[model samples]
Target: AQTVPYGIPLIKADKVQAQGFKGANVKVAVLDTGIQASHPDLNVVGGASFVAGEAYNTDGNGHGTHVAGTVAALDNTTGVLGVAPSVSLYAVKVLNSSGSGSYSGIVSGIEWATTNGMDVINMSLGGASGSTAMKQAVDNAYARGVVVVAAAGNSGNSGSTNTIGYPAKYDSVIAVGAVDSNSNRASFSSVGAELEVMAPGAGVYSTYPTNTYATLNGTSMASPHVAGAAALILSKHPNLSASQVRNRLSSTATYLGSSFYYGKGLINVEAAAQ
Candidate 1:
């Protein structure tokens, strides 16, 4: 039995749905561990592997599969639904089976997504440090009109310290934090000056590898919600540039106050799709 999780309604994806927006034709690249392309709930249009000796179509780490499911799980009757049910999902596997990959691999993945006409890139992986090469890759992709979104990292506190990781901390990427079902910031969601928005990431349920479903938490989970929301906005207004799309989401977000902890607050696809 498929269920619409609380995060879905909280983000107002249903409002977008009411207007017939399902993120159709928007290409999204999941730059994490690979996605289980064979998962029944997902529509993985294609895949590429930067990880040596690893197939890009299967997920052994399970994290990438969950993130992919959140972005575009099929609107079927037997599994969890997605934020952009009809979006074209592409797996650009930068991480290996153990959920580890180098910055070069990630940069390579970014290059692939940018060159292959990806409209959005969801990066659920990051490190506590920054690198010039990765920043350049993200910047180039953004310049070429790719809506890059990434996790704000998991090291968070009372918003005193800037704990965001690279790629997310970079100006070209949209940094996403995590909130819970009650619309409160998840304690583990990295709070930083660069945070763009928050989405439900705590105890979120979605597809796992091998046709399984599980509940997980992190800014990782939250990032894809915004990624999916970006897809919907692009689907409705395909002409909006990456920055314009970024502005659309920020201006339409439900402001919860506090810039570091919440950024522009919870994302509302209902308003963004307008």
Candidate 2:
């Protein structure tokens, strides 16, 4: 029955799930292109879109749907499961169909998620330039006890290192890097001291729009793993603050390499949840 998805056991999510911490009662917001709310394998409670005339309940681009599935796909038969299967998934559509959006949309999404009492926010998008509004929003969310996770950009292949970008470079968020199936840093994952942790991002299989699945790659895919892990920690230890959740994950990761590449190493959900 495939008790654990391919990436689940790699990151030790199976151990955490066996311990009964399925992110029950945790509220997670996937802030990206959007989410397919009608996907049968997802438990999307609600969402809001900053894009004009676009519904946050629908994922025009499959990026947000994949991220959402990784974070909280339903733990049931007939399809793949997520790291935090019971988390209340919220689709906060900040990016448009082109996979791009203004910093204002991103900030508004963060504000919405925080005001709505979301425990974890997964941002699988980034830009070359930083924004004051985005930083303020991220800080506000963290200050209000929301665990924010972001992708550490996909500029690893650009040659010259240190491509970590905004929101991810911000101090208040957990910046996630990508690792391949072999637990090796993905060549496309950005590097920097701001990088907090690594996760399975290469050839990741998860839910897609139109009720299907696909394999994708990028640090965008990696960020949700950490976000889901944060949900598991929050579910098991409800009293832990946002920073504590971040600390638990980084401190419990399986050390693999330098902070510039693998950050605190691969995410170990079982250890973090404990």
Candidate 3:
């Protein structure tokens, strides 16, 4: 019923599984449109809702399901596997079915994640700029020892340094860019000073709604890879602080040159977990 996809090879190139860390005991939250509670690949251990009328455990727009699959889809033979298949995933629904939500919702999601003791929070959604409340929430999460990872946006204009969007532009969050199967940066991935790393995103295959699998592209897809990598590092070395996890990922990245395009480079989960 389930199958391993090509993205596994890209992750294999980083030697994530070879290092023997399965992200056990790490609580990683996907703060987006939520996840499909019935999806076979997603073992959503817990979640909370910030969206007014939507369920906290179901993904109607499918973006959050794809993102969650990339981060922690089960290794079961029934579906595609994830980067940290053993990590505990929480669906912190902030965005709605149309893939839109207010900054207030996002802030609430961050606060909930922090208060609920999430070790790593992956925010694949962002706006042009963050509000003061959003910044404070991100800061508070970091202060509380949660590693926040976010997408750098899909603006794709390398000509400007401000193309990266918020929550990602925050100093406490790890901003991720997108890369293709060939290790080239995705043409649509945003570039800027805030961009911290890159990962496979183009044509990525992962779980979807209705117990299906799909391929999608965006920096949103890439952020989860680094988020899972952060979980891997914490799984192996549970004592490392959130800042240490960030440093491990950035330092172990496979350099592709130019901070403008690739940031530190494609994430090396194997090396980071080592």
TM-score of each: 0.98, 0.97, 0.96
Candidate 1 residue-wise lDDT at 183? 90
Model 2 misplacement above 4 A: 1-3, 157-161
**Tens digits of per-residue lDDT for model 3 on 96-151?**
89999999899999999999999999999989967999999999999999999999
User: Tens digit of lDDT per residue, candidate 2, span 1-274?
Assistant: 4234578888888788888998999999999999888888887899899998788888888999999998887888856889989998888999989889998899999999999999989999898898888889899999999999999999883444678987899989888999987898999899887899999899998989989888899999999988888888898999999988888898888888888888899988887877
lDDT of 1 by residue, 1-274 (tens): 7888778899999789778888999999999899988898988999699999998898989999999999998997988989999999999999999889998899999999999999999999889888989999899999999999999999977447788887899989999999998898998888889898999999999999999889999999999999999898898999899999999888789887798889999998887777
User: On a 0 to 100 scale, what is the lDDT of residue 104 in model 2?
Assistant: 85
Per-residue lDDT for 20 in model 3? 75
Q: Candidate 3 — what's its lDDT?
A: 0.87
Count of clashing residue pairs in every prediction:
0, 0, 2
lDDT of each: 0.91, 0.88, 0.87
As for lDDT, the candidate ahead, 2 or 3, is: 2
Span of ten consecutive residues with least summed lDDT in model 2: 1-10
